[PDB]
Amino acid sequence: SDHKFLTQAVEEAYKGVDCGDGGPFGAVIVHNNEVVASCHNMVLKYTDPTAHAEVTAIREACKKLNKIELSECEIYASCEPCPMCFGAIHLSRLKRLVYGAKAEAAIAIGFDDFIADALRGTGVYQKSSLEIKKADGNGAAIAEQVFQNTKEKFRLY
Amino acid sequence: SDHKFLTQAVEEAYKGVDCGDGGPFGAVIVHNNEVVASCHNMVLKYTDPTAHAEVTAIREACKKLNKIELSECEIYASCEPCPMCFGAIHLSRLKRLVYGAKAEAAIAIGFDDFIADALRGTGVYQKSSLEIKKADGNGAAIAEQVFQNTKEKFRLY
Ligand SMILES: Cn1c(N)nc2c(ncn2[C@@H]2O[C@H](CO)[C@@H](O)[C@H]2O)c1=O
Ligand SMILES: Cn1c(N)nc2c(ncn2[C@@H]2O[C@H](CO)[C@@H](O)[C@H]2O)c1=O
Numbered sequence: 306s307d308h309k310f311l312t313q314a315v316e317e318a319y320k321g322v323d324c325g326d327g328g329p330f331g332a333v334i335v336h337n338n339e340v341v342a343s344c345h346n347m348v349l350k351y352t353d354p355t356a357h358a359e360v361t362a363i364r365e366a367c368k369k370l371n372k373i374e375l376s377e378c379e380i381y382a383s384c385e386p387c388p389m390c391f392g393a394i395h396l397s398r399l400k401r402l403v404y405g406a407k408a409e410a411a412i413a414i415g416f417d418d419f420i421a422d423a424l425r426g427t428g429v430y431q432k433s434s435l436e437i438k439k440a441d442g443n444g445a446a447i448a449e450q451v452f453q454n455t456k457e458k459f460r461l462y
Numbered sequence: 463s464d465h466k467f468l469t470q471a472v473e474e475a476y477k478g479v480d481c482g483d484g485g486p487f488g489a490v491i492v493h494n495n496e497v498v499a500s501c502h503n504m505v506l507k508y509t510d511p512t513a514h515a516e517v518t519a520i521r522e523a524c525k526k527l528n529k530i531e532l533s534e535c536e537i538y539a540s541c542e543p544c545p546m547c548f549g550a551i552h553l554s555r556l557k558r559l560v561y562g563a564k565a566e567a568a569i570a571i572g573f574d575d576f577i578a579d580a581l582r583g584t585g586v587y588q589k590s591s592l593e594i595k596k597a598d599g600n601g602a603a604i605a606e607q608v609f610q611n612t613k614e615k616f617r618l619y
């Protein structure tokens with residue numbers, strides 16, 4: 306189930322790259338085992354540098370549920386959330402985060418060195434409380450492979 | 463002119479709390495002394511926990527200028543930006559940040575203990591690049607007073 310939803314976030318990353326919507330990033334929000342939102346990076350579609358996949362998923366899931374907190378849902382991210390997205394995950398009060406690729410995989414292919422301390426556990430003023438799971442095995446290999454497979458198929462941002 | 467745009471952000475904070483749009487926060491984005499966007503927190507109005515003042519202003523300024531980078535623009539925040547909003551400001555490529563009140567001023571009236579390590583220089587992984595100015599003098603006084611004056615008018619969300 307973790308694997309099913311992480312793979313769907315990865316698939317969203319591929320879809321969004323193929324549509325020219327944005328970069329190779331997807332995110333899926335589920336309530337128990339029911340998909341609430343499934344999104345990819347929309348920075349180029351919306352002309353909106355905040356429209357990362359996680360932020361997009363959070364906005365859509367709060368709209369679908371008519372409330373500004375998601376304490377009963379979990380989020381699956383094809384890549385390690387950046388500082389903006391991890392902050393949005395804190396404010397959204399999602400109860401769990403599962404992510405596939407380490408940020409280093411995205412950095413290696415042209416993106417910024419832009420890593421969230423609170424996620425890695427080196428925050429001082431920003432302390433996370435949500436449960437965090439870095440995928441291993443096949444999930445990790447799938448997520449890491451996204452950046453090799455899409456290496457020169459999208460405009461950087 | 464720093465004072466002018468900062469007090470415009472303070473007035474946006476008051477306006478939004480009075481319309482019920484969200485909490486007492488405002489942000490103004492400016493391009494060579496021309497105001498590109500003037501917004502306040504819209505979390506309640508939009509049912510969106512990411513719709514802080516700064517993020518909302520970044521969305522609007524980018525839509526207006528037809529680009530995803532505001533490298534020639536500056537942002538005035540009535541209150542010190544939270545981790546999400548500092549992440550957004552970095553992603554937007556804004557040239558300069560000027561903020562009024564320290565985050566403790568918001569926390570004193572019940573807001574989340576939620577401070578951006580990269581803004582205060584306390585991170586291991588996330589470093590900041592942009593010019594940052596904490597206002598002082600009469601601007602800082604008016605900005606800090608917003609939360610004590612506001613207390614009555616909105617319910618913390
Ligand atoms: C969803 N999503 C995520 N998760 N990350 C992105 C995105 N766009 C650029 N990035 C970069 O990825 C690194 C962070 O890991 C940083 O360089 C960020 O700038 C994006 O849409
Ligand atoms: C614009 N804006 C800002 N700047 N901060 C906000 C907002 N809504 C809640 N907060 C809280 O303020 C502290 C951060 O300084 C944290 O407690 C945050 O949760 C908001 O819309």
Ligand SMILES: [Zn+2]
Pocket residue numbers: 357358359386387388389390391
């Ligand atoms: Zn992000």
Ligand SMILES: [Zn+2]
Pocket residue numbers: 514515516543544545546547548
């Ligand atoms: Zn914020």
